Amino acid sequence: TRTRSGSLAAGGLNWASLPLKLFAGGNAKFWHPADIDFTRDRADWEKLSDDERDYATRLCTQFIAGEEAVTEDIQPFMSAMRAEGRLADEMYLTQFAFEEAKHTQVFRMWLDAVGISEDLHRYLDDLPAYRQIFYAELPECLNALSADPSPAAQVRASVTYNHIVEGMLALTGYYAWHKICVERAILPGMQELVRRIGDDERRHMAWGTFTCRRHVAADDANWTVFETRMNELIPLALRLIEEGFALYGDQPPFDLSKDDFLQYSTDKGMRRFGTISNARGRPVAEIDVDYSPAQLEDTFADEDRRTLA
Amino acid sequence: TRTRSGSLAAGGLNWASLPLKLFAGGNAKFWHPADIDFTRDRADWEKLSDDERDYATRLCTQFIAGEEAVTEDIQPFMSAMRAEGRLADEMYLTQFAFEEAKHTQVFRMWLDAVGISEDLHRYLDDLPAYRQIFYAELPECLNALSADPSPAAQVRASVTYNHIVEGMLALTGYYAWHKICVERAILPGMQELVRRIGDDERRHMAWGTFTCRRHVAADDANWTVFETRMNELIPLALRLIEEGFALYGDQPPFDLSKDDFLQYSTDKGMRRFGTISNARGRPVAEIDVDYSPAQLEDTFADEDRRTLAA
Ligand SMILES: CCCCCCCCCCCCCC(=O)O
Ligand SMILES: CCCCCCCCCCCCCC(=O)O
Ligand SMILES: [Fe+3]
Ligand SMILES: [Mn+2]
Ligand SMILES: [Mn+2]
Numbered sequence: 175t176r177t178r179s180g181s182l183a184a185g186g187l188n189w190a191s192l193p194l195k196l197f198a199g200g201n202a203k204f205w206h207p208a209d210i211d212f213t214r215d216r217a218d219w220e221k222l223s224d225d226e227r228d229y230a231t232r233l234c235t236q237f238i239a240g241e242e243a244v245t246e247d248i249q250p251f252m253s254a255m256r257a258e259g260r261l262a263d264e265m266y267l268t269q270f271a272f273e274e275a276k277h278t279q280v281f282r283m284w285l286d287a288v289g290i291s292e293d294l295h296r297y298l299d300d301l302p303a304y305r306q307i308f309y310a311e312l313p314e315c316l317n318a319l320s321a322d323p324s325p326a327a328q329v330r331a332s333v334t335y336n337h338i339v340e341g342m343l344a345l346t347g348y349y350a351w352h353k354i355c356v357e358r359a360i361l362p363g364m365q366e367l368v369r370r371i372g373d374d375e376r377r378h379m380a381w382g383t384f385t386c387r388r389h390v391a392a393d394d395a396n397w398t399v400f401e402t403r404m405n406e407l408i409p410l411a412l413r414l415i416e417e418g419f420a421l422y423g424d425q426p427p428f429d430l431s432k433d434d435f436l437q438y439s440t441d442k443g444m445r446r447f448g449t450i451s452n453a454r455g456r457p458v459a460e461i462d463v464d465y466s467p468a469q470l471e472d473t474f475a476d477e478d479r480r481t482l483a
Numbered sequence: 484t485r486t487r488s489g490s491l492a493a494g495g496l497n498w499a500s501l502p503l504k505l506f507a508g509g510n511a512k513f514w515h516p517a518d519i520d521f522t523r524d525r526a527d528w529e530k531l532s533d534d535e536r537d538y539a540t541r542l543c544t545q546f547i548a549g550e551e552a553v554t555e556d557i558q559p560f561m562s563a564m565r566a567e568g569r570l571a572d573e574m575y576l577t578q579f580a581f582e583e584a585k586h587t588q589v590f591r592m593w594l595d596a597v598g599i600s601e602d603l604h605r606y607l608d609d610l611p612a613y614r615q616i617f618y619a620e621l622p623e624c625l626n627a628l629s630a631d632p633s634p635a636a637q638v639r640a641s642v643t644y645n646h647i648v649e650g651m652l653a654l655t656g657y658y659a660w661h662k663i664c665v666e667r668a669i670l671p672g673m674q675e676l677v678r679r680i681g682d683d684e685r686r687h688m689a690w691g692t693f694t695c696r697r698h699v700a701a702d703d704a705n706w707t708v709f710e711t712r713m714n715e716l717i718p719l720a721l722r723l724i725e726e727g728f729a730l731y732g733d734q735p736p737f738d739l740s741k742d743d744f745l746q747y748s749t750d751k752g753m754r755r756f757g758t759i760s761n762a763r764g765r766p767v768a769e770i771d772v773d774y775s776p777a778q779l780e781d782t783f784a785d786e787d788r789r790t791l792a793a
Contacts, residue, residue, distance in 0.1 A: 175618075175619070175622045175623055175626065176552070176555070176617070176618040176619075176622050177618065178604065179547075179548040179551050179552075179603075179604070180551060181547045181548065181550075181551045181587055181590070181591055182544060182547065182548055182602065182603035182604050182606075182607075183602060183603075183604075184600065184601065184602045185600055186591050186594060186595065186600065187588075187591045197584070197588070198517075201515055201516060201517065201585070202515065202517065204513055204515070206510050206511065206513070207510065208507075208510065208511065235491060238488075238490045238491070239488040239490065239491055241490075242488050242489060242490045242570070243485065243488070245573065245574065245577060246485075246565055246573065249558060249561050249562055249565060252558050252561075252580075253558055253562075256555050256558060261551070264554070264555070264584075265554065265584035265587065265588070266584075268554065268577070268580040268581040268583070268584040269581050269584065271561075271577040271580065271581070272577040272578045272580070272581035274577070275506070275573070275574040275575075275577040275578065276510070278490055278574065279496075279506070279574070281490070282490055282495050282496050285495060286495060291493065291494055291495065292493060293491060293492060293493040294491035295487065295488070295491050298488075298491075308485070309484075309485040309486065310484075310485075313484045313485050314484060317484065
């Protein structure tokens with residue numbers, strides 16, 4: 175079924191290309207889960223109330239279940255790239271998939287360190303919107319790539335995975351861990367965990383930005399494809415946040431505000447249009463070798479850290 | 484399409500399971516391609532004959548094409564595990580796949596560091612047996628898993644990928660690099676590269692052993708499946724080595740002996756049979772949590788180093 179090898183081509187691999195830059199950067203930024211000290215977090219964990227632990231278990235459950243979902247649901251995109259003959263994108267997606275496995279590993283290591291061994295499916299039960307995104311929308315949109323690796327489907331898939339799950343919901347998730355851990359000077363492991371995954375997640379967001387950009391740049395009809403999926407998904411994501419808060423009667427532990435999160439989340443969502451729009455008109459041959467989507471993600475992380483202080 | 488999350492299960496993930504054990508140690512044994520010093524290599528590379536550089540370029544072309552092939556052809560196996568619902572296997576295979584991309588990366592780094600920018604396809608022209616393994620058997624057998632994730636097909640895929648490509652063809656290639664570099668005290672980059680990817684390869688073969696083992700333990704018909712595939716592939720694998728030597732008149736550069744490599748390859752090939760057969764009769768529940776496929780791969784690698792002192 176194979177007739178040729180990308181790595182045997184003239185000039186070889188293009189080290190300037192966006193997906194290879196991200197790949198090189200993931201190698202330089204690699205971290206070990208065994209290096210995270212978890213030996214302090216159980217002491218903190220027990221000094222919390224029955225209600226504080228309920229929220230934190232429910233957030234961790236949404237995380238690890240979401241981490242697992244992405245480790246699985248990225249394979250079709252890898253398959254699409256193999257089919258499309260894009261070796262650089264393909265190689266990066268291996269690192270992508272591996273990174274998601276490592277996040278799934280490390281959240282499981284935290285649950286074990288705080289001594290949670292019971293079945294956790296019940297924490298997603300009161301969250302019908304969570305399951306709509308992670309058991310339904312994420313895999314169905316991504317698996318559609320196996321039948322239809324069309325530019326339109328790749329955008330719809332990227333929007334769903336990269337821009338909403340990672341770009342909007344995960345960042346919102348991290349903000350929740352900031353409010354829980356940093357403000358109350360607790361759970362140093364979870365903090366180091368959230369830092370380290372946050373780091374990996376930035377190359378992921380960069381990649382989603384790259385993918386949507388190159389498609390928009392080549393055929394401007396795809397902008398509308400991007401727009402529409404974003405518009406379907408934002409209300410669903412906001413809904414997830416509301417349900418999490420409504421469970422605690424809008425007045426939750428850790429002094430968390432419903433409207434604070436809704437404003438914080440929307441900001442992460444809308445900011446995605448800006449990432450993609452500047453590709454309209456630009457030539458594809460520049461989008462390939464353009465590092466900016468990774469830069470944008472650095473300055474986004476920068477702006478986020480500034481906002482906290 | 485998803486109804487449950489494996490990581491939310493009671494007891495969580497089984498850290499004792501073989502695929503998670505390899506993942507853990509993959510993390511610990513992670514290496515950076517940017518740590519490998521390639522500077523010294525172009526100095527040695529230019530002090531070689533034309534006949535020497537040809538063989539070395541032909542071996543590297545076969546390697547870097549082989550690495551790329553495995554990076555592509557393993558995605559179906561991931562899909563199979565996703566379908567069979569085996570999370571520990573999935574997780575490991577993501578690291579597996581990533582490793583292959585990093586080997587592809589690092590061979591290309593080498594080719595750059597020595598000054599090779601020409602199209603390298605012309606080096607697989609005279610190797611029809613290479614193109615049969617890597618452009619036909621490997622993808623066609625592995626892509627079969629997307630339509631048919633059955634035990635039989637998984638055994639057939641693992642035999643192709645892990646037991647022959649990795650277990651027999653890759654180790655023979657490493658041996659070639661040993662006889663080329665270590666013996667002639669040249670190419671310290673290629674050397675560091677070869678032992679570093681070798682470290683990864685051992686976990687890949689360990690997984691290959693685990694996969695075939697758990698299928699044979701559960702159904703003894705899968706032994707015959709294993710046996711049949713191995714018997715198909717071995718001849719083709721020796722063919723590859725014979726074609727590669729016959730290009731240099733059986734008398735190639737670096738003083739490489741054809742019969743030496745056939746006997747060396749054969750040994751790597753046959754040892755695979757013994758790796759899987761001891762699972763016959765054994766309980767499947769034991770194999771899931773048994774680390775010996777990774778131990779065996781360590782004692783094999785140790786046995787190989789020892790052989791070299793001769
Ligand atoms: C009320 C708190 C809202 C927090 C949202 C739930 C957290 C979901 C985690 C998102 C999954 C991350 C996937 C990834 O690693 O890219
Ligand atoms: C002339 C001697 C023949 C040398 C054997 C060709 C090289 C084997 C292909 C490399 C396969 C690598 C697969 C892997 O890294 O898992
Ligand atoms: Fe390998
Ligand atoms: Mn992640
Ligand atoms: Mn390899």
